[PDB]
Design a protein around this motif. Structure first.
Motif, PDB file in Angstrom:
ATOM      1  N   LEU A  48      55.808 -49.428 -32.200  1.00 56.46           N
ATOM      2  CA  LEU A  48      56.117 -48.359 -31.260  1.00 56.46           C
ATOM      3  C   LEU A  48      57.183 -47.416 -31.803  1.00 56.46           C
ATOM      4  O   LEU A  48      57.171 -46.228 -31.477  1.00 56.46           O
ATOM      5  N   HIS A  80      47.448 -45.585 -28.951  1.00 61.25           N
ATOM      6  CA  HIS A  80      48.258 -44.965 -29.994  1.00 61.25           C
ATOM      7  C   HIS A  80      47.539 -44.854 -31.334  1.00 61.25           C
ATOM      8  O   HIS A  80      47.635 -43.815 -31.994  1.00 61.25           O
ATOM      9  N   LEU A  91      47.874 -50.726 -25.953  1.00 62.80           N
ATOM     10  CA  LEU A  91      48.709 -49.756 -26.650  1.00 62.80           C
ATOM     11  C   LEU A  91      48.140 -49.397 -28.017  1.00 62.80           C
ATOM     12  O   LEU A  91      48.329 -48.272 -28.482  1.00 62.80           O
ATOM     13  N   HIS A 118      56.464 -43.501 -32.004  1.00 62.53           N
ATOM     14  CA  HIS A 118      57.228 -42.606 -31.141  1.00 62.53           C
ATOM     15  C   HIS A 118      58.356 -41.881 -31.866  1.00 62.53           C
ATOM     16  O   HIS A 118      58.552 -40.681 -31.647  1.00 62.53           O
TER      17      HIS A 118
HETATM   18 FE   LIG Z   1      54.082 -46.396 -25.465  1.00 63.93          FE
END
Ligand SMILES: [Fe+3]
Lengths: 172, 172, 172, 172
Positions: free
Chosen positions: C165, D169, D165, C169
Motif C-alpha cells: 500500500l 490497485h 485491494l 499510495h
Molecule cells: Fe487502499
C-alpha cells in the motif's frame, strides 16, 4: 529456484552479470572521455557531447541487461566498476580510436555470450542479444570507423583545424 | 547616516564604488575591442559583435552594483573611466587573451571585495557578490579560455583561415 | 597551471574528485536497490522506480561536480566505483533506512567539503556547494525520514500489506 | 504438395497444429477463470477482466499460428478443445498460480517447437517463434510471478482484504 525461472542456465546468468559489469565500465570510460574534452585546454564541446551520449547509451544497455536478468529469474550480482585506463585521451582522433577498440571488445563479449546461449539452447536469450545488442554494436563500430577515417584524412591531430572542423561539421 | 543603512561598513561602500569604476572600465575596453574588429582592414563581424555584447554586459554589472549601493544606503561616487591600454588589438587571438586577463583581474577584485564583506560580517553583500558576480566571472573566464585554446590550436593568427572560420563557426 | 585557474586550491580539487567518486558510488547503490525491487520474488514496481530515479539524480550530481572541476581549471581523476555493500536489501523499509544512512553520509562529506572551501577562502566553491548540493541533501534526508516513519507506522515489513500500500499510495 | 511450400518439414507442421490446439485450450482455461470471478459469491471484477483479456490474447496467438501454417503451405488440422481441469478456481491467488503453471507449460511446448525448428533447419519458423511467442511468454510468466508474490505477501486468500485491494490497485 525462482518461480519464473525456466530454461535459464547458471552459466548464462553469470555471463549476463559479467556483461552488465562490462557495459557499466564502458559507460565509465565514455564519461571519462566526455570530461576530457570539456577541459579548458581541449575545449571541443561536440566531442564531449558525443561521448556523454555514448556513456548514457551504455548505461541504458546495462539497465536493459539487468531487466533481462530479473525477467528470467536470475539474480543480479554487481561488481566493482574499474576506473578507465587513462584520464588524458590526448586528441579527438585517439579518443575515437580507443572508443572503436572498446566497442569491438564489447561486441566480442556479446558474441561469446550469444555462443553460450546457443550452446545451452536458450532461444529467448539468443533473440534478446541479436535483437537489442549485436546490430547496435555493428552500427556503433561502423560509425566510429567512419569518424576515425574522416579525422585521419583531415590530418588530425597534427592539423589543428581538423578536429575543430570535425567537431563543428560532423559532431555538431 | 541614511535612514535605510544597516550593517553596511564604509570600507564596503568604498570598495563597491571602486568595483563600479572597474566594471565601467571593462565595458570601455570591450567597446574598444569591438570597434577594432569593425575596421575595414580587420573585418571580423562576429568578433566585434561578441565584444560589443561583453561591453553591454559589463555596463549592466556596473548598473547592478550602483543599484546595490543605493539599496544599502551607501552613496555612489563616480571617478574617471580610464581609456583602454591600446587601440590596436592586433588579432582575434590577442584580443581574446587580453579579455581573459581582464576578466581574471575583475574576478580578483571581486574576490577581494568578498573577503572584505566576510571580514566585516555583511552576509547580504557576500550573498550578492556570490550569487550575481563570482559564478558569472567563472563562466566568462572558462569561455574565454576555451576560445583562446581553440584559436591557438587552429594556428591563429598566422593561419589566416583560423580567425575567419572561428568567427563563422564559434562566434557566428 | 590551467589558464583559467584562479583561487582554486589543490586540496579543494582533490576533495572535489573524492566527492565525484562518492556520488557515483551512491548512484551505483541506488541502482542495486532498484534492481532488487524488480525481482519476481519482491515485485514492488514503484520502489524500484523511486530508487532508479535516485540513481539517475546521483549521477547528475556527479556530472555537475565534474563540470565544476573543469570550470575551475582542476583536473578530474576517476577512481574505481566500489560495489554496494549488499545485493539483497531485504525489504522496502530496510532499503529506505539504508538510503537515509547513505544520504546522511553524502551530506557529511559535502559539509566537510564546504568547511574546506571556507578555510581556503573559495567563495565560488562555497556558493556552488550551498546552492546546488546542501539544500537538496536536506530535502532528500527529510523525504527519506518521512518514508521510513510511514513504513514503520504501517507495520512494515511484518505487515505484508504495508509495503504494497505504501508502494501504491506514496510512491505510486 | 502446396505450391508455396518450401523448407517446411511435416514434423514442424504437426507440431504447429499441436501448438494451435494448446493455445486454444489455454484460451478456454482463462475463460473459465474469468467466469469464475464473475460469480456473485466471488465478485472480483478486475480479476475476471484480467483473465478475459488473457483468454482473448491466447486466441489471437492461436490465430497467428493458424496464419503461419497457411502461409508456409501446411494444412491446419483442428482437434477437440479439452475442458479445463476445474470449474472452481478457489481464490485469486490459486487462479494466478495455475495461470503461472499454464504459461510455463505453454512456454515449454514453444521451446520444444523451437528446438524442432532448429533441428530441421527452418530459420523462418525459428524467427517466427522467437519474435512473436518466446518473449511474450517470458513477460507473461514474469507478470504472473509478480502477481503471485504480491498476493502471497498481502496474506491472500486468508486475509480477505488482500484480494480486494489487489483487485482495486494492481488489476484496476
Ligand atoms: Fe487502499
Amino acid at each position: 529456484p525462482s518461480q519464473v525461472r525456466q530454461n535459464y542456465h547458471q552459466d548464462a546468468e553469470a555471463a549476463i552479470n559479467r556483461q552488465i559489469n562490462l557495459e557499466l565500465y564502458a559507460s565509465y570510460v565514455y564519461l571519462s572521455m566526455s570530461c576530457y574534452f570539456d577541459r579548458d585546454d581541449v575545449a571541443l564541446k561536440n566531442f564531449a557531447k558525443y561521448f556523454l551520449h555514448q556513456s548514457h547509451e551504455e548505461r541504458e544497455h546495462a539497465e536493459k541487461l539487468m531487466k533481462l536478468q530479473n525477467q528470467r529469474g536470475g539474480r543480479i550480482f554487481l561488481q566493482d566498476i574499474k576506473k578507465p585506463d587513462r584520464d588524458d585521451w590526448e586528441s579527438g582522433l585517439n579518443a575515437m580510436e580507443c572508443a572503436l577498440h572498446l566497442e569491438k571488445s564489447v561486441n566480442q563479449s556479446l558474441l561469446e555470450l550469444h555462443k553460450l546461449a546457443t550452446d545451452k539452447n536458450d532461444p529467448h536469450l539468443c533473440d534478446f542479444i541479436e535483437t537489442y545488442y549485436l546490430s547496435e554494436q555493428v552500427k556503433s563500430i561502423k560509425e566510429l570507423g567512419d569518424h576515425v577515417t574522416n579525422l585521419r584524412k583531415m590530418g588530425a591531430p597534427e592539423a589543428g583545424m581538423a578536429e575543430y572542423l570535425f567537431d563543428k561539421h560532423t559532431l555538431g
